[PDB]
RNA sequence: UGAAACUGCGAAUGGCUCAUUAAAUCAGUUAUCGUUUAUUUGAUAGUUCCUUUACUACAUGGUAUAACUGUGGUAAUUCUAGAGCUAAUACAUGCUUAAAAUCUCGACCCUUUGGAAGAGAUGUAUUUAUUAGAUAAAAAAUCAAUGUCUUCGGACUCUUUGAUGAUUCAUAAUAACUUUUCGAAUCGCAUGGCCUUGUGCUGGCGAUGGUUCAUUCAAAUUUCUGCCCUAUCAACUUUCGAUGGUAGGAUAGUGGCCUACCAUGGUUUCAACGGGUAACGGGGAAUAAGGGUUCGAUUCCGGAGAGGGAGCCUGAGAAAC
């Protein structure tokens, strides 16, 4: 990757113009924008050159409604990934709570680069694949 | 086969029989009409010119110019095609028909008719049958009884003795299309309703435009002052 | 169940139509309003259960027929018009004028007014927009369409009209101090101040106010309808102004008022 | 007066019955910004022809046939045939129309900050692009076509704006689209205004249509939350659709509904899938101190069948018995 065509059918952020007729400087545009929520766009969005649509920043994803995280579980997915969120529930009976957990699918830009382990805050898009919902927004490494 | 007969112009009409089989032979295959004839056909036609129609077969189905055999069958039907009728905007059934080539399994079938010929029939060539109803638009009647596009119908407008025995009473039509000093009224309110409703828009449009920009004119002594 | 549906089992009417419980199998129901369905009404409900000015339905439809009642200044002969908060609802025979508009406890009310007020109301600003051959405009809780209107006029307010025209009189503001109404949640059927919205952002705001006995509180921005400042409230308010009582005190005012 | 039949609308309710069915029916709530809607109730179409001075019947045009007639066949059944006829609110067509506005051409004049006679289209439903459809508050430039007034330096001053929690909605605006939807060839009762005295110009009440739009009785699908017995049933589904993507066909629509290619997912000891049920669900019935245990095939609300199984004709409305 890093090269950018790679996926035969070419590649661009739609939409997007340059003037090989017009004084060119900068040669190359970007389309780029914020989240939001709170949130800090980082630099590698406005300077990496990938494309993705599926990126927040880099294309066209809305976020929206959950704001959640957690524990990185495996990574091996071509700009994709996985989380738990161990959590806590409580029987009416015996009064107590027990470890449970669900897995999460979710996309993920060049913007970050996460192993495994790390603490991670996610979106919420329109649907994004088979399973698949939310979209990485921010890392929170050692 | 009996025959059903349609001498259109009068408008009569008229059944035959035939009942030989020697002189019946014919029609036996000339599809939907192929004229069939009528000197091998009945020599009370002579001469006579009989275009094939259609009409009914035995156990006795519709026929159907369309479909291209001699054969007894069962297709879909739509609110479109004849044979059928369709009982809801959106509804199709299956039936049967025995084609529009004929062949001996028919009761009845069609003789309308082109040239008449020679021989004289009793009651189709003889009685006529009226001009049954009557047309409507007058621009219809200037094409029936002329009105002299501009004297007016109203006058020679076709209507209907009728009789109470003691005292006869005058059915007549209502036109429809017929231009007034009610219909040229509503052209009429319409234009000024297309201009009314417009002097109002470009108006406030601008009213808009001057009162948005007693503001954006003073947002410059809106700065420097207050 | 396939397209959509169109009775309505009485139970599932809304508890404040105060429908009775028996004999009518079915209530109604509102058919495709300028108002929301549940806050709001049909005229077949407060032309018998209410007012009586009906005895049957049928009697309800045939003062209706008769083109003889004029919501927002204009006839209908629904007999299911899917009137609401705010309304005009005028008395042809009668100069009779009731503002809908709840009651304290809880209701909807039967509020008389003034046959100089029906006049205008109090259009909610519910969105903005340059639309159709670049012109701009806002739409009103009331589900109703308004055209050329001032810059000024921002997103979370009311706009008194004229009901005769659609015109857009005055506007207020939404500021730390103004008087509100609050039309639905624990609290409708109050008011009244803005003490402190609190943004955030997704969506949810918040709101604080108070009221004429100082008592206080927390409710959703959406469900808030700004009518005047503290004063002038641009109306009139029912009985008891909209106050809430610990039932300590209301049940006093039956014990106070005990005459007969 | 009225047999029969031509159309009309009915028969898709209603009654019975419960064999099937275990997250399916079903109860409580939700949604329609996911669709169709006989009627019933309320609004609702003057630019239909035609390159428009001697026009197309609109004083109202034409086909065909049932009944009836008569000539019949078969052991037989609500069996039909071949003939002379005749109407429709059947069957098929086709005139009627105002003023206006507005748009895209441009015969000629005049080189201006470009005017012009009349030529056709715009009535509506269809199809499809595209545009508006504003408004969270107050203020400097150049244009590229020049919309309004020239105080002959320029300006542009009061300029339209509906609902929504929310839209690309609501309706309007252009360029063409369509085996062109409609715009009354009806009908019973009153039958009288005035003449410019032709049984004409004009005139009551009422019906049956009818294009849409809402409505309304609905249907369809639809969120959530809820089922009895079984581990001597612990892993299920992706043969061939199991789970999603993207596009098309499909539908009245949505959606692997089905197919093109794609990705490898979705369920599971908080009991899935399997096996059982002498299971149609509930409202509720027995019992009755409290807490309970059983039964609800059966008088109301849903669903399901019509001896099994399928497929579909009509109609808005059926997989009908």
């Known amino acids: 990757e890093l090269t950018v065509q790679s996926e035969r059918a070419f590649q661009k952020q739609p939409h997007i113009f340059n003037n090989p007729k017009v004084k060119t400087s900068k040669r190359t545009k970007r389309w780029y924008k914020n989240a939001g929520l709170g949130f800090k766009t980082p630099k590698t969005a406005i300077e990496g050159s990938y494309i993705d649509k599926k990126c927040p920043f880099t294309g066209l994803v809305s976020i929206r409604g959950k704001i959640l995280t957690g524990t990185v579980v495996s990574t091996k997915m071509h700009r994709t990934i996985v989380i738990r969120r161990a959590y806590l529930h409580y029987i009416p009976k015996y009064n107590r709570y027990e470890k449970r957990h669900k897995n999460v699918p979710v996309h993920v830009s060049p913007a970050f680069r996460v192993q495994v382990g790390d603490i991670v805050t996610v979106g919420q898009c329109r649907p994004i694949s088979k399973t698949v919902r939310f979209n990485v927004v921010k890392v929170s490494a050692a | 086969m009996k025959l059903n007969i349609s001498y259109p112009v009068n408008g009569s009409q008229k059944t035959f029989e035939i009942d030989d089989e020697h002189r019946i032979r014919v029609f036996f295959d000339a599809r939907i009409g192929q004229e069939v004839d009528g000197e091998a056909v009945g020599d009370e036609f002579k001469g006579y010119v009989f275009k094939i129609s259609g009409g009914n077969d035995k156990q006795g189905f519709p026929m159907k110019q369309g479909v291209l055999l001699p054969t007894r069958i069962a297709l879909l039907l739509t609110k479109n095609v004849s044979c059928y009728r369709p009982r809801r905007d959106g509804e199709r059934k299956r039936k049967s028909v025995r084609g529009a080539i004929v062949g001996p399994d028919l009761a009845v079938l069609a003789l309308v008719i082109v040239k008449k010929g020679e021989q004289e029939l009793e009651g189709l060539t003889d009685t006529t049958v009226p001009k049954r109803l009557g047309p409507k638009r007058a621009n219809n009647i200037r094409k029936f009884f002329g009105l002299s596009k501009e004297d007016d119908v109203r006058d020679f407008v076709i209507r209907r003795e009728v009789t109470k025995g003691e005292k006869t009473y005058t059915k007549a039509p209502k036109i429809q299309r017929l231009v007034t000093p009610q219909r040229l009224q509503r052209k009429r309110h319409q234009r000024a309703l297309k201009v009314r409703n417009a002097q109002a828009q470009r108006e406030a449009a601008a009213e808009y435009a001057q009162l948005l920009a007693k503001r954006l004119s003073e947002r410059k002594a809106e700065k420097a002052e207050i | ?260």
């Open chain 3, 1 to 260: 169940a396939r397209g959509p549906k169109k009775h309505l089992k009485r139970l599932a009417a809304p508890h404040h139509w105060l429908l009775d419980k028996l004999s009518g199998c079915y209530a109604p129901r509102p058919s495709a309003g300028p108002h929301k369905l549940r806050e709001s009404l049909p005229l077949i409900v407060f032309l018998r259960n209410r007012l009586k000015y009906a005895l049957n339905g049928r009697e309800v439809k045939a003062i209706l027929m008769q083109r003889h009642v004029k919501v927002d200044g204009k006839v209908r002969t629904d007999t299911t018009y899917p009137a609401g908060f705010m309304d005009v609802i005028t008395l042809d025979a009668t100069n009779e004028n009731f503002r809908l508009v709840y009651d304290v406890k809880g209701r909807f009310a039967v509020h008389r007014i003034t046959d100089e007020e029906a006049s205008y109301k109090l259009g909610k600003v519910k969105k903005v927009q340059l639309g159709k051959k670049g012109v701009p405009y806002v739409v009103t809780h009331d589900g109703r369409t308004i055209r050329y209107p001032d810059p000024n006029i921002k997103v979370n307010d009311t706009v008194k009209i004229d009901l005769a025209s659609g015109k857009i009189t005055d506007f207020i503001k939404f500021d730390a101090g103004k008087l509100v109404y609050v039309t639905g949640g624990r609290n409708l059927g109050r008011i009244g101040t803005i003490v402190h919205k609190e943004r955030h952002d997704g969506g949810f705001d918040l709101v604080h106010i108070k009221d004429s006995l100082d008592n206080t509180f927390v409710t959703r921005l959406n469900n808030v309808f700004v009518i005047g400042e503290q004063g002038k409230p641009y109306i009139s308010l029912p009985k008891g102004k909209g106050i809430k009582l610990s039932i300590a005190e209301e049940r006093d005012r039956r014990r106070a008022q005990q005459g007969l």
